[PDB]
Amino acid sequence: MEANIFCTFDHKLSIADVGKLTKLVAAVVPIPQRLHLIKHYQLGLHQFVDHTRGYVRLRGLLRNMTLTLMRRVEGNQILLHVPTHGLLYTVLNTGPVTWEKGDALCVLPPLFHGPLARENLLTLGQWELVLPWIVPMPLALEINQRLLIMGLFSLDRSYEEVKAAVQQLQTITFRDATFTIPDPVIDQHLLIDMKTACLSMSMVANLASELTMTYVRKLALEDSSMLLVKCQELLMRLDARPQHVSPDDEIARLSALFVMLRQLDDLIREQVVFTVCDVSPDNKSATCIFKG
């Protein structure tokens, strides 16, 4: 493959440019095209950043891009390296997210972090080095889930009904940090995701057994605990011997239901790109296994 990529700069880089570009060695930067030679405009997310179009659009563009690790900069050349599956690399988190050991990491567009400064880097003319966020899986599928629930809830609601609920949904709290999702528009892509959610939920409701349906009621008759209280409360405002006992029916239905559940899960789950096992005690870099 094109194991190395040359990025050439058209703007002459000052002393400060070369310095700050050197400090960024091992940062994860994406390229759209996977070519041996590219120009600095194609580097990063700045080619696509567009706040009138939503967060989901930039998410869709990013999840299809090719990701690279920055290496030594020389005169007007930056030398990006593509990681390969199963090997071990040192990666840099320019994002404000905390990494704990053993985390599985995903790539997402940046979110709004409180201070609003966000450290603009390499503003050459009116180009800018907009790097993505390398986020651990829990926060990644939390943002994907909240974004889907905003799309699914706020349809056919007016702005007055919507306002407080989506204000509460946009804010995510993760490891004592606080982030906000920038532009959650109701895209065409988001409507496709919502349609897949509806079909998968219909198949869950249709093909579920009677055991899988009625377990909770029987446990509530048998048992009482805080978890069961919460589960009952979710069903409350809408709220016997089996007449068929069929292990083959149960196996057929369950092997189909797991398929539908994986379909519904893929709307929330992102692709793991790195897995960490060593974290610098200042949380500025990690040792990672590259995955794809």
Partner 1 sequence: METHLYSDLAFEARFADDEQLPLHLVLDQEVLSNEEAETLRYVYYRNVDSAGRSTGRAPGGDEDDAPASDDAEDAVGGDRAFDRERRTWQRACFRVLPRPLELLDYLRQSGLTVTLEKEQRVRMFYAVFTTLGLRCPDNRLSGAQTLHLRLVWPDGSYRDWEFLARDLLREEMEANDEVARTDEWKGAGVSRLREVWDVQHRVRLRVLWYVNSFWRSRELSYDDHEVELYRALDAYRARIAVEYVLIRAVRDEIYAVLRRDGGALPQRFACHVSRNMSWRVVWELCRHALALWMDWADVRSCIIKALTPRLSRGAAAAAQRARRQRERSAPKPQELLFGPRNESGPPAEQTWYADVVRCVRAQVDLGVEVRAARCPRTGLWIVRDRRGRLRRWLSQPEVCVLYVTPDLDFYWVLPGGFAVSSRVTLHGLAQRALRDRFQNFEAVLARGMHVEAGRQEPETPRVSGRRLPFD
**Given the rule CB under 8 A, which residues bind partner 1?**
52-54, 150-151, 154-160, 162-163, 166, 183-188, 191
Q: Based on CB atoms, which residue is closest to partner 1, 103 or 187?
A: 187
Buried b (16+ CB within 10 A) or exposed e, 233-272: eeeeeeeeeeeeeeeeeeeebeeebeebeebbeebbebeb
- 27 burial (CB, 10 Å; 0-12 / 13-18 / 19+) is buried
Q: Between 121 and 194, name the residue whose CB sits nearer to partner 1.
A: 194
Residue 121 C-beta: closest distance to partner 1, Å? 27
96 near 134, Cβ under 8 Å?
A: no
Least distance CB 182 / partner 1 (angstroms): 9
In the complex with partner 1, the residue whose CB is nearer, 6 or 48, is 48
CB of 28 to partner 1, least distance (A): 29
Instruction: Give ∠ CA 185-189-195 in degrees, rounded to 5.
Output: 105
User: Whole-number minimum distance, CB 149 to partner 1, in Å?
Assistant: 11
Smaller CB separation from partner 1, 152 or 264:
152
- Least distance to partner 1, CB of residue 214, Å: 24
Residue with Cβ nearer partner 1 (130 or 147): 147
Nearest partner of 95 among 179, 8, 156, 185, judged by Cα = 179
Q: 176 to each of 62, 96, 164, 172, how far by Cα in Å?
A: 27, 11, 23, 10
HSE on the CB side for 226, CA within 13 Å? 0
Q: Nearest approach, Cβ of 262 to partner 1 (angstroms)? A: 25
Q: Which is nearer to partner 1, 185 or 220 (CB)?
A: 185
Rounded to 10°, the helix 159-170/137-154 angle is: 180
